[PDB]
C-alpha cells in the first residue's frame, strides 16, 4: 500500500526525479496538518460502530425492501454481513484518511468489490446509499458537527480532511 | 512501500482493526521525525549530481581494476551506467527519506540487486565503496543538521548492509 509520502515518491519515480521542492512542500503541509489528520481519524474510529450502524439502519429505513424476504438484508446472517461490510468499508476509509492516500482502500477493499457484490446479488444502489450515509456521518464527526456526540479538539478548520473522507467514500461508491 | 504509516496500517488491517492509539502515535512519530528526514531529502535532492559524482569517483578510485577489460566499467558507457546506478540508489535514498522508511529502497534497488549484480558481474563492493564514501563525506552542520545526517547515514547504512 501507499501513503501520501509514498504516493509523492511514486509520482517522482515515474520521471526518475528526486522529490521536488513543491512535492516536498506539499508533504510538509501534510505533516503540519498531521495532528488534525490524527484527530479526524480518531473522530471516525471513536464513532465507527455508531457510523456503521446508523448508515445501515438508514439504508434499510429508506429502502424497506432490503429486510423483506428476498432482500439482501433479510436474515440476521445477511444483516450481519451488511454491518460487517459497512465496518470494513469504514475501516479502509479510515486507513486512507490516516495514510493520506487512497491506495490502501482501493487495492485492499475496492479491488473486485463490485464484481463480488454482483456475484452475491448485493444491490449496488443500497450499498452506495449506505456508503454515502457513512460519508455524511464521518464528515460530520470530522467537523465535530454530529448532533449527539461532540469530541473536544483545538478550534480550527478540518475541511481538507473532511473532503478527503468524502472523496474516499466517493471512490467506494464509484467502485461499485 | 514500507513506512511508519504503511506498517501500522498493515498491522491494523491484518488484525481487521480500526486505527487505534498506537497507530496514531506512530504517525505522530512520522510527524516528529519528518523535519529531519525531509531536510536530508531536500539536501540530497538539491545536491545529488555532485554527491553521485563524488561517490562514483571514490568507487573507481578504490577499485581501479574495474577499468580493466572484461570488468564492470571497462567501457565509458559502463562507467556512465555505474554513475547512473549510484544516481538510482541516491534517488531511492531520497525517496526513503521522504517516505520515512526503507520501502523505496527495498522494492526498487534491493529486492533483486543480488541476482542482477551476480548476472552482470557487478561487485557489490563497488557500490559499497560509493555509499561508504558518501556516508563518510557528509559533515555536520556543514551539509546537514545532526538529525538529518542521522537519517541520511541510516539510509546509506541500510543500502550498504543490503549489499553486505
Amino acid at each position, epitope marked *: 500500500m501507499l501513503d501520501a509520502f509514498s504516493r509523492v515518491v511514486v509520482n517522482s519515480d515515474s520521471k526518475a*526525479a528526486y522529490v521536488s521542492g513543491s512535492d516536498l512542500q506539499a508533504l510538509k503541509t501534510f505533516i503540519a496538518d498531521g495532528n488534525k489528520r490524527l484527530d479526524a481519524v480518531n473522530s471516525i474510529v471513536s464513532n465507527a460502530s455508531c457510523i456503521v450502524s446508523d448508515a445501515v439502519s438508514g439504508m434499510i429505513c429508506e429502502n424497506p425492501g432490503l429486510i423483506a424476504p428476498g432482500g439482501n438484508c433479510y436474515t440476521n446472517r445477511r444483516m450481519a454481513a451488511c454491518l460487517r461490510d459497512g465496518e470494513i468499508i469504514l475501516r479502509y476509509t479510515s486507513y486512507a484518511l490516516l495514510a493520506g492516500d487512497s491506495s490502501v482502500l482501493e487495492d485492499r477493499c475496492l479491488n473486485g468489490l463490485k464484481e463480488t457484490y454482483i456475484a452475491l446479488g448485493v444491490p449496488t444502489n443500497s450499498t452506495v446509499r449506505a456508503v454515502s450515509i457513512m460519508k455524511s456521518s464521518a464528515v460530520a464527526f470530522i467537523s465535530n458537527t454530529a448532533s449527539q456526540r461532540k469530541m473536544a479538539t483545538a478550534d480550527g478548520d478540518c475541511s481538507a480532511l473532511s473532503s478527503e473522507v468524502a472523496s474516499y467514500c466517493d471512490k467506494v461508491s464509484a467502485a461499485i | 512501500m514500507k513506512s511508519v504509516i504503511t506498517t501500522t496500517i498493515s498491522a491494523a488491517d491484518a488484525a481487521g482493526r480500526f486505527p487505534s492509539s498506537s497507530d496514531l502515535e506512530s504517525v505522530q512519530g512520522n510527524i516528529q521525525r519528518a523535519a529531519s528526514r525531509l531536510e536530508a531529502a531536500e539536501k540530497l535532492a538539491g545536491n545529488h549530481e555532485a554527491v553521485v559524482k563524488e561517490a*562514483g*569517483d571514490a568507487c573507481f*578510485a578504490k577499485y581501479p581494476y574495474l577499468k580493466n577489460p572484461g570488468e564492470a566499467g571497462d567501457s565509458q558507457e559502463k562507467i*556512465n551506467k555505474c*554513475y547512473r546506478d549510484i544516481d538510482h540508489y541516491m534517488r531511492l535514498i531520497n525517496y526513503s527519506l521522504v517516505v520515512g522508511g526503507t520501502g523505496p529502497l527495498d522494492e526498487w534497488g534491493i529486492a533483486g540487486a543480488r541476482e542482477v549484480y551476480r548476472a552482470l558481474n557487478l561487485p557489490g563492493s563497488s557500490y559499497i565503496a560509493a555509499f561508504v564514501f558518501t556516508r563518510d563525506r557528509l559533515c555536520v552542520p556543514r551539509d546537514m543538521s545532526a538529525q538529518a545526517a542521522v537519517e541520511f547515514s541510516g539510509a546509506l547504512d541500510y543500502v550498504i548492509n543490503s549489499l553486505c
Partner: single-chain antibody
Framework: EVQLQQSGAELARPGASVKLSCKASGYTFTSYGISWVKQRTGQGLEWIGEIYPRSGNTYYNEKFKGKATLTADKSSSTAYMELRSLTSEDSAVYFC?????????????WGQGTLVTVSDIQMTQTTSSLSASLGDRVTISCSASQGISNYLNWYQQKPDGTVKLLIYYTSSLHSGVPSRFSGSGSGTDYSLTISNLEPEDIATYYCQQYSKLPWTFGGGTNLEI
C-alpha cells in the same frame, strides 16, 4: 550540433543587475548541465557555477554565491545567469558551457561568450606564455595542488575568444580534435602535447580539474607562433 547561443553584450551600472542568457540547441537540454565561466580582461577562466535543468539543482563557486544566480527554462531550453550588485570586478566575458553529469563532467561545448561591462584545488600552469614554430612539438604542462584522479580537461581558447574542449579525462580527444593533440598525467602533474603545430593551434590553453568542486581552471598558457 551543439551551439549554446548566448545573449549579447550588456552594459550596466554599479549596483545594477544583469540577466545573462544562453539558448541551447542540438541536444537534449535536460541530459546535460549548464556551467558559467567568468573570464576577466586578459585573465584566465573561472568557474562561476553549474545548473542541471533536469533537476534545477545549482552548484556555485563560493566566490560567486548570491552574486550569481543560476536558473533554467526547460520549455525554451535556455539557461540564465543573474549577476547582482554589479561592480568593476564583474567586468568580464561570461561563457555558458554544456556540462556533463558524472564522469563526463566536461564543458564540452561553449557559448560565444557574453561580455559584461561594469580547500579548492589550485590549478597551476607554470609557463604562462609559450612561443614556437610550425611543425614543432610543444608541451603544455600544469600541476594540481592536490592529487586528482586524471579528471582533467584541456580547453583551447582562440584569440577570437571562443573556447573549445580539446582533451577530457587527461587523454581522451573531443569529437573534432585532431590526433596532433595529446594529454598525459596520472597524479598532480599533467601535460598537453601538440605534435606538428599548425597555425590553427595559436590559442590559450587551459587545464581544468573536475576531481572536486568547485571546478577550477589553470592560469592559462598563451601559445604564439
Amino acid at each position: 550540433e551543439v551551439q549554446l547561443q548566448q545573449s549579447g553584450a550588456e552594459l550596466a551600472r554599479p549596483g545594477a543587475s544583469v540577466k545573462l542568457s544562453c539558448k541551447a540547441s542540438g541536444y537534449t537540454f535536460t541530459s546535460y548541465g549548464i556551467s558559467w565561466v567568468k573570464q576577466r580582461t586578459g585573465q584566465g577562466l573561472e568557474w562561476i557555477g553549474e545548473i542541471y535543468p533536469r533537476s534545477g539543482n545549482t552548484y556555485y563557486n563560493e566566490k560567486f554565491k548570491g552574486k550569481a544566480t543560476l536558473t533554467a527554462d526547460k520549455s525554451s531550453s535556455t539557461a540564465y545567469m543573474e549577476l547582482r550588485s554589479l561592480t568593476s570586478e564583474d567586468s568580464a566575458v561570461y561563457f555558458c558551457a554544456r556540462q556533463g553529469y558524472y564522469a563526463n563532467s566536461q564543458f564540452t561545448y561553449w557559448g560565444q561568450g557574453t561580455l559584461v561591462t561594469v580547500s579548492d584545488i589550485q590549478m597551476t600552469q607554470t609557463t604562462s606564455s609559450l612561443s614556437a614554430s610550425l611543425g614543432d612539438r610543444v608541451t603544455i604542462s600544469c600541476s594540481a595542488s592536490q592529487g586528482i584522479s586524471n579528471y582533467l580537461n584541456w580547453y583551447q581558447q582562440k584569440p577570437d575568444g571562443t573556447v573549445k574542449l580539446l582533451i577530457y579525462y587527461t587523454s581522451s580527444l573531443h569529437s573534432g580534435v585532431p590526433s596532433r593533440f595529446s594529454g598525459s598525467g596520472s597524479g598532480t602533474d599533467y601535460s598537453l602535447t601538440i605534435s606538428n603545430l599548425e597555425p590553427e593551434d595559436i590559442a590559450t590553453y587551459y587545464c581544468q580539474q573536475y576531481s572536486k568542486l568547485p571546478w577550477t581552471f589553470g592560469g592559462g598558457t598563451n601559445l604564439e607562433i
